[PDB]
Scaffold this active site. Structure first.
Site, PDB file in Angstrom:
ATOM      1  N   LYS A 181       0.844  17.146   1.873  1.00 17.39           N
ATOM      2  CA  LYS A 181       0.187  17.324   0.575  1.00 17.39           C
ATOM      3  C   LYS A 181      -0.090  18.802   0.338  1.00 17.39           C
ATOM      4  CE  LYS A 181      -2.219  12.850   0.958  1.00 17.39           C
ATOM      5  NZ  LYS A 181      -1.619  12.128  -0.187  1.00 17.39           N
ATOM      6  N   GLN A 220      -8.244  11.662   2.034  1.00 23.10           N
ATOM      7  CA  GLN A 220      -7.187  11.050   2.836  1.00 23.10           C
ATOM      8  C   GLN A 220      -7.662   9.741   3.440  1.00 23.10           C
ATOM      9  OE1 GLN A 220      -3.433  12.383   3.823  1.00 23.10           O
ATOM     10  NE2 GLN A 220      -4.049  10.348   3.106  1.00 23.10           N
ATOM     11  N   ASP A 277      -5.101  10.988  -7.269  1.00 21.37           N
ATOM     12  CA  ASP A 277      -4.402   9.843  -6.685  1.00 21.37           C
ATOM     13  C   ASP A 277      -4.263   8.734  -7.732  1.00 21.37           C
ATOM     14  OD1 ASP A 277      -2.989   8.661  -4.603  1.00 21.37           O
ATOM     15  OD2 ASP A 277      -4.770   7.828  -3.636  1.00 21.37           O
TER      16      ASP A 277
END
Lengths: 283, 284
Positions: free
Chosen positions: A53, A97, A120
């Site tokens: 990421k 995460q 997200d």
């Protein structure tokens, strides 16, 4: 015979476009998008995924803020970190995460993220907003699959689409994206009575099952588009997909090879979300 | 002809009693009575009628009612502040805004201001998202009501092929999320759907919410199918003719809702049920 969807190449094109946009912003005196990525604990998988990421974040030239916390960080401390990131106008996206330590309430922590910084895109508000045809920030994996469909030049309006793997986190969102995109959408799951009949009527098949050979290649309708992404949205390391590729590829007009680009597309749309947030939601 | 009739009005009346009897139990036991704040802005005749219906039902089950009949010119900011105060009032379990609003208000921003926690209507995006991810907070009340209608048939929804006809409608998506949580395989159709007949005729369960008379032909109905026809008005059903061709469908369906039916009473009854749930389970 089927043409190939190359999610890896589309994810790279997408990172390149985002990087160029960011260069156009920075010369214009506009604020560079910021992304805070928070890791809690030691999980090797999570360290690898977070690492991808941040590598993607740096390529695209975002402002980035790494937060590598220890596993026993309190729920309250973590809330205060998320509270502070929401109130920081330099940060457009906040990523937590997954998975998180057992003591931490996963849902409480993720829902604390301002939906307009939830890049997200799976915050309940964000899925609800997608459901009612006016998304704020779209769930990035489904969004990434719509980008895959877009690259085929197919007209989704009136297409009969089937989503295989409702139970998966992407499944309901994927259905809401396809409906938004004009498709008639059937959603199946482990208790669906006759999967073969559903799949064989479909012009578009999206499978995220994590069950090798679940969809027989014989079930694929001639001319169908077949997307096979499995259950891992961060990295596809499967040697065999949920769809039986050989026959599937004989009948489909378009198919994603396996292993495919679901991870890179997910990260690319995650960044795309961060940029959109900066351009459109945060001033 | 031959289909057992789903009677939404009976079920709704039965549900109001249960809420009532539970409220009387709380009242006999010194526990707090649920509170419902119902906001009306403007003076539209149908909107007045619908709030009246909501407030009759609200008084029948013995809730605390707070009525805000505001003038049509009421500022959006003033209405925000009203919502803010109601959100922090521990006596209020449900905050309801009668729609439509006057067009000068951003109706999304106002409705989303309500804590999903007190969103007894249940269409707050948060609430729909929680339903989407199998962990509902307060369920959208019209779809919940349709799930109750289905539960009263005694049918097993697991592995049933369901079709929802009305993606356009505000109920459509939530209906589908409800049906999926119930274990159905669910197809959602809309105006761009090709071969609507093929989708309907394969369905063990048809939920239609289109506001289009005769849209679904009775001949398309599968033999033994359950058929719910609720139109597009969630608060009242005054149709002379439904979305499904009733006469022929009734000869084929096992269960079917007559039209005009009980979508309104059922919707209000589930809204009240969400208020009680809020009171008993989400607040102190």
């Amino acid at each position: 015979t089927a043409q190939l969807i190359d999610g890896k190449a589309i994810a790279a094109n997408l990172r390149q476009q985002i990087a160029q946009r960011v260069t156009e912003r920075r010369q214009q005196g506009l604020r560079v998008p910021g992304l805070a990525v928070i890791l809690v604990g030691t999980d090797p998988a999570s360290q690898v995924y977070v690492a991808h990421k941040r590598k993607d974040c740096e390529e695209v030239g975002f402002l980035s803020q790494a937060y590598d916390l220890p596993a026993e960080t309190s729920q309250d401390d973590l809330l205060a970190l998320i509270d502070r990131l929401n109130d920081d106008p330099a940060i457009d996206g906040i990523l937590v995460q997954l998975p998180l330590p057992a003591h931490l309430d996963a849902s409480l922590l993720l829902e604390r993220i301002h939906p307009d910084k939830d890049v997200d895109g799976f915050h309940p508000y964000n899925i609800g907003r997608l459901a009612q045809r006016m998304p704020l920030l779209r769930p990035c994996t489904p969004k990434g699959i719509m980008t895959l469909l877009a690259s085929t030049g197919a007209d989704l309006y009136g297409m009969d689409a089937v989503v295989v793997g409702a139970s998966n986190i992407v499944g309901r969102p994927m259905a809401l994206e396809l409906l938004l995109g004009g498709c008639t959408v059937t959603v199946t799951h482990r208790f669906t009575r006759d999967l073969a009949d559903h799949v064989s009527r479909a012009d578009l098949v999206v499978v995220a099952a994590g069950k090798p050979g679940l969809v027989k290649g014989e079930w694929i309708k001639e001319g169908a588009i077949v997307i096979d992404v499995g259950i891992n949205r961060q990295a596809d390391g499967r040697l065999v997909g949920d769809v039986e590729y050989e026959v599937a590829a004989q009948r489909a007009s378009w198919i994603t090879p396996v292993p495919g680009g679901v991870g890179p597309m997910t990260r690319a749309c995650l960044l795309e979300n961060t940029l959109h947030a900066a351009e459109h939601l945060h001033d």
